[PDB]
Amino acid sequence: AMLILSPNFEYEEITRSFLSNMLAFTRGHFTGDISHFSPIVLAEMEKDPNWLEEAAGGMQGVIVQSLLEDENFSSVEQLKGELARLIRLYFALAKDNLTENQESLYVDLFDKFTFLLLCSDEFIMYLDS
């Protein structure tokens, strides 16, 4: 499978969900606001007091390590800058503080990350499990 050289539409929903969770977990970690956390996620946090921080940082790490092999970024700091920007916009979005133009920027960046993760063999390996 290394020696067999290589759209992934079927992973789209799981990938948007991964991204949306990383965002929610990242914000909850910084705010302590756990208001629209799923009851299942709330129960995981009960057993383990580092669960949330570990989930958010684990998921960010997976995105960066995946996308460091994508031709679309030239430096590590461009990649992290783009992720940090998605995260920042999401914080503004959570409090209904985006202009229409910023909402465009947010959705465009969320879709770009979605698309580039679908193109990452390493990310697909990770989703498969």
From TrEMBL:
One Pfam family this sequence matches: DUF3206
InterPro entries on file: DUF3206 (IPR021571), EF2947-like_sf (IPR036798)
Name of protein: DUF3206 domain-containing protein
Species in which this protein is naturally found: Enterococcus faecalis (strain ATCC 700802 / V583)
